[PDB]
Design a protein around this ligand. Sequence first.
Ligand SMILES: Cc1cc2nc3c(=O)[nH]c(=O)nc-3n(C[C@H](O)[C@H](O)[C@H](O)COP(=O)(O)OP(=O)(O)OC[C@H]3O[C@@H](n4cnc5c(N)ncnc54)[C@H](O)[C@@H]3O)c2cc1C
Ligand SMILES: Cc1cc2nc3c(=O)[nH]c(=O)nc-3n(C[C@H](O)[C@H](O)[C@H](O)COP(=O)(O)OP(=O)(O)OC[C@H]3O[C@@H](n4cnc5c(N)ncnc54)[C@H](O)[C@@H]3O)c2cc1C
Ligand SMILES: NC(=O)C1=CN([C@@H]2O[C@H](COP(=O)(O)OP(=O)(O)OC[C@H]3O[C@@H](n4cnc5c(N)ncnc54)[C@H](OP(=O)(O)O)[C@@H]3O)[C@@H](O)[C@H]2O)C=CC1
Ligand SMILES: NC(=O)C1=CN([C@@H]2O[C@H](COP(=O)(O)OP(=O)(O)OC[C@H]3O[C@@H](n4cnc5c(N)ncnc54)[C@H](OP(=O)(O)O)[C@@H]3O)[C@@H](O)[C@H]2O)C=CC1
Ligand code: HEB
Ligand code: HEB
Ligand code: HEB
Ligand code: HEB
Ligand SMILES: CCCCCCCCCCCC
Ligand SMILES: [Zn+2]
Lengths: 446, 621
Amino acid sequence: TRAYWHNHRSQLFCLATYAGLHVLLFGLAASAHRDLGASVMVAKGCGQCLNFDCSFIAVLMLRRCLTWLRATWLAQVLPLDQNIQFHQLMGYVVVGLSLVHTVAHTVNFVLQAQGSASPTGVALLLLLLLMFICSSSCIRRSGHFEVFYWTHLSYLLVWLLLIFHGPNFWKWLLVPGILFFLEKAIGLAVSRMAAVCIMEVNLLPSKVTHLLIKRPPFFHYRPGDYLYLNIPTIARYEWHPFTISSAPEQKDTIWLHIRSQGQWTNRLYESFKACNIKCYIDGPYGTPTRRIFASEHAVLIGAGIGITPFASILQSIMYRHQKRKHTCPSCQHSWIEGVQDNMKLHKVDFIWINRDQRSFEWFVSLLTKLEMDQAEEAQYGRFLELHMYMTSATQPGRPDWSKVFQKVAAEKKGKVQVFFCGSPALAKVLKGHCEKFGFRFFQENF
Amino acid sequence: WLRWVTQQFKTIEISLQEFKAALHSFFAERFFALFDSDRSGTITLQELQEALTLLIHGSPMDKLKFLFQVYDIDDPDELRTVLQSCLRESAISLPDEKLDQLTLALFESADAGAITFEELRDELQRFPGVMENLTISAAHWLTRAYWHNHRSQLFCLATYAGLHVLLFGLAASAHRDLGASVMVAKGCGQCLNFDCSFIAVLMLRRCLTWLRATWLAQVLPLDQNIQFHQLMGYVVVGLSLVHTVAHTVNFVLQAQGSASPTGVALLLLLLLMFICSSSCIRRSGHFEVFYWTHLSYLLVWLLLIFHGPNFWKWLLVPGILFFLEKAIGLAVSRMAAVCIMEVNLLPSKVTHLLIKRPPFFHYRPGDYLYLNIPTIARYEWHPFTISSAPEQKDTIWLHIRSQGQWTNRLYESFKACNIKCYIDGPYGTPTRRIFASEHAVLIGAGIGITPFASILQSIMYRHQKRKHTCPSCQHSWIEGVQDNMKLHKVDFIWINRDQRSFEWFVSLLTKLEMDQAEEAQYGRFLELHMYMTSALGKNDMKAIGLQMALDLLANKEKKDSITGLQTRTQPGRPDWSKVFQKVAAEKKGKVQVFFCGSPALAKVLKGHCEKFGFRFFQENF
Ligand SMILES: Cc1cc2nc3c(=O)[nH]c(=O)nc-3n(C[C@H](O)[C@H](O)[C@H](O)COP(=O)(O)OP(=O)(O)OC[C@H]3O[C@@H](n4cnc5c(N)ncnc54)[C@H](O)[C@@H]3O)c2cc1C
Ligand SMILES: Cc1cc2nc3c(=O)[nH]c(=O)nc-3n(C[C@H](O)[C@H](O)[C@H](O)COP(=O)(O)OP(=O)(O)OC[C@H]3O[C@@H](n4cnc5c(N)ncnc54)[C@H](O)[C@@H]3O)c2cc1C
Ligand SMILES: NC(=O)C1=CN([C@@H]2O[C@H](COP(=O)(O)OP(=O)(O)OC[C@H]3O[C@@H](n4cnc5c(N)ncnc54)[C@H](OP(=O)(O)O)[C@@H]3O)[C@@H](O)[C@H]2O)C=CC1
Ligand SMILES: NC(=O)C1=CN([C@@H]2O[C@H](COP(=O)(O)OP(=O)(O)OC[C@H]3O[C@@H](n4cnc5c(N)ncnc54)[C@H](OP(=O)(O)O)[C@@H]3O)[C@@H](O)[C@H]2O)C=CC1
Ligand code: HEB
Ligand code: HEB
Ligand code: HEB
Ligand code: HEB
Ligand SMILES: CCCCCCCCCCCC
Ligand SMILES: [Zn+2]
């Protein structure tokens, strides 16, 4: 659709520039070997393309530097949450190109039939087929992940073999390769790790587990800071990110809501379907959101399914709001302090738009809780308003942004803002509606 | 002891001149007069022996009689003169009315018309232990030291010299066949390829900050990068000189195209930079002229590309790193066209900027910033520590001390507002570990105590923002914790030679302490200790007499006259045993020490913390 193109705009640009660079290198090597007949030309071309891919696959799968890029607007412009299913694509392309390359050189060696390169080539083809065989989803689907890791560790020996197999290859391999080695060196046992222990585990409906891990003493995170969880019982060497779904004012534990959407998280749900186990979290990462707490009548709008950090944001807002309701220990006169200047809000909206509540029952329960929490406080003033839409049947059907925005602009609470977390098809609509009413728009990357 | 006395006497007849020279002042004159018992002006061996026996081996009554004889210049006028001489020796800069009131109080509390010697002893009896502890400061008579601090800089200098002798030998061995000329020429060629390449990667004003926060700042020096860079420049000039003379001797031996033209060009360019980048160009010149002339590093690198055939191999990494960082820094990268709200000139040539806090400017307590002023130096960017707590929402302070050519020129110019300045936002190590503790002991030794001002002001702001008062009953009560500061007490121990440029810090701590001293009746939350070690120690008889009036003035006013502080200022170095014992005596939580100073005290404090079980820290700033 038109909005499919608008959302996938930043994906199609990257895919097309990749295909363009491939055809550029292919044609460059084609021209430089036009003299040879139809077999070493395509072979040299595919060789150049393989150099490029077999080099940059690693930097495509760079873990630590990718997080640092996710914080800036760079995450806004190009999609850097897709690195895994761009990595699998570049792997498939390496396999296809290496296969056609072997076919080209074997046809050439047959035509010439009418060392260091060829044996190393056979071994390289065998290893690439090993990785492409023991790295497909059928290997992690069944509950063996360490087999996958051990087989797919052979990229090291593939790089070794390829160093003294392609003449100009080490030039390509060096910079991404040295970046990869640097990042694997920075990441050591307990560099930013912590051997925290699960204090409890719940199993909410819709196959979502609700980890209550034990808070590490010196672990301080802003609301919305995701962590990279690791559970040896499930998979020893996998590190899947997860968004902390508990307001930082939680001093005892750290929640994590882990929705079943794959092979690791499914393994987690099924395993605990049978608590104190080992976990190794890796720090708080994510965008700092002080623009919300330093605002008035913020309008948090979360669409799609990237709204787990809004649970943390809303719980932190309501905690810091309850933390300004004083009562005299003698007169019992309860008076409400004005702004604390660490949170400057006078109202909040929350418009969660989705297609259903398939996986988010914990979210709906938490929002009813935070709405009933101040429901008796609504006698003088309502702080948190909840607008939840479903668009498939709670006000069913898509909203009317003119209507809800005019309802916002109806009463005067201050400088109305917007914060958004969703599909860029809707982000520009919100930017247009937003500067129409003088609402200072913002957009969040999570 | 007779041998030491004879040696000391032989070391100087010993007239009053050599006496004052060995003793290192009107007190010195009185001592020279009272030492020669025969009033002969020269100190014989017998007179010096008797003086030493009466001072060291003499009883406290003998020392008291000697002090009384030295004090009676013939009363209040003599006491005032002696106290003035002592303060001149003690660097105690007090007002004339302050000294008058001190002399009056001393004459009131000591004279029971004239200070009687019996009355003098009866009053000195109030001084506990000072009787036996009475000892003249002149008797004080009876390198790896700075390497202990330089154990990290000398590491860098040594590895640098090693990585030069390595390249020199590597190039000399490969070309030993050439006779005595091209060997050193090619050695210097390689050393130049290294220095002219890395001298700029030393100047990373952006990546160093990221490295300044890490423990790499603890292991190797990251503040003295400018001096290491100047040193590498000096050795580039020296090496270029020997390299040109090597090639010219080679040429004249052979005579007995890129080489010669680009050689002359690089030689002249490096000489131009070495001339227009000395101290004199900025002491009495335009910082802009310095910047423009010494911008020629681009031209030097360029002409070096097609002069050293394999030089670009070196220049690849540092050149691209330098240009990457320079491109990251753009006109609105993180700059902010901040407007000075107002400036002051606090004493000791320190200027005090109040720059208007940008609306979207959030800094932790103790974050520095790279201030620039297009009026002082158009292009230089100097770092400075925010000396205003974050909870202060109106303006950002900056306490800038004249310690060079930029800051000094700033002070001079303002000595003659709404100007433009381009700060570079917050930096620095995180400081939340100071707030998440109990009875933290912030110790600031040396000249790194500007962020402790910010931290103390933020701590007191939060403390005052956890004191409540009901609008109805007016019942005032306190809270337990605010979840952003869990402290229960703070001890600020501040060692320095003198109050030279920190009287603003003094006037700030006075404010903090007295702002809650009237609440210390039920609980004291911040304890201020201030040590000016250069002041005369409480063991010196003159210093004993001076304290014998300072203490009375304190009891009269309840304010230590030196600073108006509620606490008293303790001259001399601290006995960390007693300090940590007093810390451990009371129980306010898990003690945590913090520190910012020279490693010489870092090791002492780490040893004592292991002795007393306190989790010593040392923040990097
Ligand atoms: C910052 C962030 C926070 C997230 N928080 C949550 C959360 O709280 N709850 C939740 O249910 N999901 C969350 N996800 C998405 C995802 O479900 C988990 O991150 C995790 O990747 C699931 O692993 P999986 O076994 O299902 O992956 P697979 O089933 O093996 O892979 C299928 C999908 O998972 C993605 N994926 C696989 N490995 C990774 C990886 N290492 N990093 C990122 N994506 C990966 C693939 O791109 C694809 O979309 C988050 C993603 C990100 C980027
Ligand atoms: C994080 C930090 C915070 C500081 N805060 C203060 C403060 O609040 N008040 C204060 O009086 N001083 C402070 N200084 C020290 C110093 O006075 C200033 O940093 C300032 O840069 C000195 O300028 P100058 O022109 O006098 O130096 P110059 O006269 O130009 O140089 C002489 C000395 O200054 C150093 N220096 C010169 N240029 C720089 C530069 N760009 N960056 C760092 N050092 C340089 C040299 O290494 C040498 O030690 C701080 C230093 C650092 C590293
Ligand atoms: N960098 C990128 O390229 C990014 C891409 N994405 C894209 O996000 C998509 C997520 O799938 P999905 O979440 O289904 O798509 P959406 O993100 O469009 O669904 C989000 C919600 O917005 C609602 N919505 C869309 N337009 C309007 C409107 N005009 N008025 C009111 N409500 C509206 C939809 O309702 P209904 O479902 O009823 O239409 C849906 O429930 C992925 O396909 C991915 O490609 C995500 C992030 C960034
Ligand atoms: N990593 C490094 O190499 C660093 C080095 N420095 C050092 O900072 C120094 C600055 O001069 P300065 O700050 O005077 O050097 P110091 O830090 O040694 O002097 C600072 C204060 O510490 C006091 N002091 C020193 N040793 C003791 C002790 N054993 N017991 C009690 N008090 C003590 C001094 O008292 P008194 O003056 O009375 O002796 C002085 O008041 C430079 O010489 C430099 O070497 C600075 C930063 C880091
Ligand atoms: C270069 C070479 C190479 C190649 C060819 C490849 C190829 C591939 N691949 Fe690879 N990978 C790689 C190299 C590679 N690769 C690396 C290096 C990585 C990273 C890992 C780590 O870090 O450990 C990866 C990673 C990876 C991953 C991740 C895991 C997680 O989750 O953690 C995946 C899934 C993949 C898949 C794949 C596929 C499917 C393919 C096709 C065959 N991979
Ligand atoms: C990785 C993937 C891969 C694979 C599998 C392969 C496989 C192969 N191969 Fe190769 N190659 C390659 C990649 C490859 N490859 C490269 C990259 C190169 C380089 C390119 C250029 O040219 O640059 C080559 C190159 C090459 C050559 C050329 C030589 C040189 O060194 O120069 C030849 C002959 C070949 C053959 C071959 C064969 C026969 C095979 C199978 C057995 N290869
Ligand atoms: C060519 C190369 C080079 C050389 C040889 C040099 C050499 C030198 N240098 Fe230099 N620098 C440089 C390159 C250089 N350089 C750079 C690149 C820089 C940085 C700048 C910027 O960043 O802008 C500097 C920077 C610099 C500075 C800084 C400024 C401020 O304060 O901020 C100074 C002072 C200097 C000095 C010097 C000296 C004294 C010498 C000796 C002559 N230095
Ligand atoms: C800047 C500093 C510098 C300077 C000034 C110079 C200056 C000079 N120089 Fe010199 N070089 C150099 C640095 C230099 N340089 C280098 C670095 C090189 C290279 C070395 C290698 O091996 O790398 C050379 C090189 C050179 C050579 C060899 C060959 C080529 O490379 O082409 C020669 C012959 C020369 C000469 C010379 C002369 C004659 C002069 C003066 C005029 N050198
Ligand atoms: C099939 C989807 C392709 C998406 C391409 C994403 C590119 C991510 C680049 C990440 C660089 C670190
Ligand atoms: Zn009351």
